[PDB]
Amino acid sequence: IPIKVSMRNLSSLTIAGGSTISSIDIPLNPLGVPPSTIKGTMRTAVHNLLPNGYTSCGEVEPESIREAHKNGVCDVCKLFGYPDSLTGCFTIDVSKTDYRTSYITRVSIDDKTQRAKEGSLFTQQIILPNSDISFTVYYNCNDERLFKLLLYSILDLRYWRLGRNTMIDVKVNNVEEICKSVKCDEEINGILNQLSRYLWE
RNA sequence: AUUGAAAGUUUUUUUUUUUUUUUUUUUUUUUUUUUUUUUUUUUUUUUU
């Protein structure tokens, strides 16, 4: 079930990728925004903002993940996949490319005085705000509670940082096919309506 | 059902301080309010 999600950053969004040829203190990924960044950020938001009636490992160590999975549910961990049990649950791909770029710099003001610290000046590469990013979340499994959890994940992504504490506003450009596919629930309809438009008009 | 897997390149840092668009520069120098015009004409200090 495809989910055509369009996200537009509300600030000077940026991520650090890398390049052998680079000079900016804060690099950028050559392709743009990778699916891994989105997936990890969404998982973090879900764990920190966990909807009622769900379980989250909230662990980085795979051994700790296994220890949490000793009981063995971790609804969030099931949605994002066991380390070595399930092949997968959902996929993220980004098609749009060719973002805008500009080099800015930042300082660190002294505390005792109000002047900039001598030698605390570093630069940062950013993506210009109000730039649209479209990515599709292909959920291949067959489960409604996990699908609702994924929708809650996307919704919570709105109230969450994405790269250098940069605010974002997620928008879903498909409600008709989502309702047509399966489980056009009233709660599902309400959350999809909430995600249908930007939080900030 | 890929040899096979699951991890946000993330956190954290105010491009800030020092500096009066300031001093000097007189809206003055010149030009007669003069110029032609008669306070003039008419009238008996006086009658029954």
Numbering used by the authors: 2 to 202
Sentences from the paper on this structure:
Here, we report the cryo-EM structure of the Csm Type III-D complex from S. solfataricus (SsoCsm), which uses CRISPR RNA to bind target RNA molecules, activating the Cas10 subunit for antiviral defence. Type III CRISPR effectors use their crRNA guide to bind cognate RNA molecules, which typically arise from mobile genetic elements (MGE) such as viruses that have previously been encountered by the CRISPR system. This binding activates the Cas10 subunit, which in different species harbours an HD nuclease domain for ssDNA cleavage, a cyclase domain for cyclic nucleotide synthesis, or a combination of both (reviewed in (Tamulaitis et al., 2017)). Type III CRISPR effectors are evolutionary related to type I systems and both share a CRISPR RNA (crRNA) binding “backbone” made up of Cas7 subunits.
The structure of the SsoCsm complex bound to a 48 ​nt crRNA shows its architecture in unprecedented detail. We solved the SsoCsm structure at a final overall resolution of 3.52 ​Å. As the complex was purified from the native host, the bound crRNA is heterogeneous, being sampled from the over 200 spacers present in S. solfataricus P1 (Rouillon et al., 2013; Sokolowski et al., 2014), so the 40 ​nt of the spacer have been modelled as uracils. Overall, the structure is reminiscent of that of other Csm and Cmr complexes (some examples are shown in Fig. 1A), formed of two intertwined helical filaments of multiple stacked subunits wrapping around the crRNA, although SsoCsm is the tallest. Examination of the foot of the complex shows that there is almost no protein:RNA interaction for the Cas10 subunit, while Cas5 makes tight contacts with the guide RNA molecule. The final nucleotide of the 5′ handle, G8 (sometimes also known as position −1 to discriminate between the handle (−8 to −1) and spacer (1 to X) regions of the crRNA), is flipped, as seen in other type III complexes such as SisCmr (Sofos et al., 2020). The remainder of the crRNA adopts a regular pattern with every sixth nucleotide adopting a flipped orientation. Previous studies showed that SsoCsm is unusual in not cleaving at one of the flipped sites, generating a spacing of 12, 6, 6, 6 between sites (Zhang et al., 2016). The missed cleavage corresponds to the Cas7b subunit (1432; chain N in the PDB file, Fig. 3C and D), while subunits competent for RNA cleavage are Cas7a (1430, chain L in the coordinates file), Cas7c (1425, chains F and G) and Cas7d (1426, chains H and I). Analysis of the structure reveals conformational flexibility that most likely relate to target RNA capture and Cas10 activation.
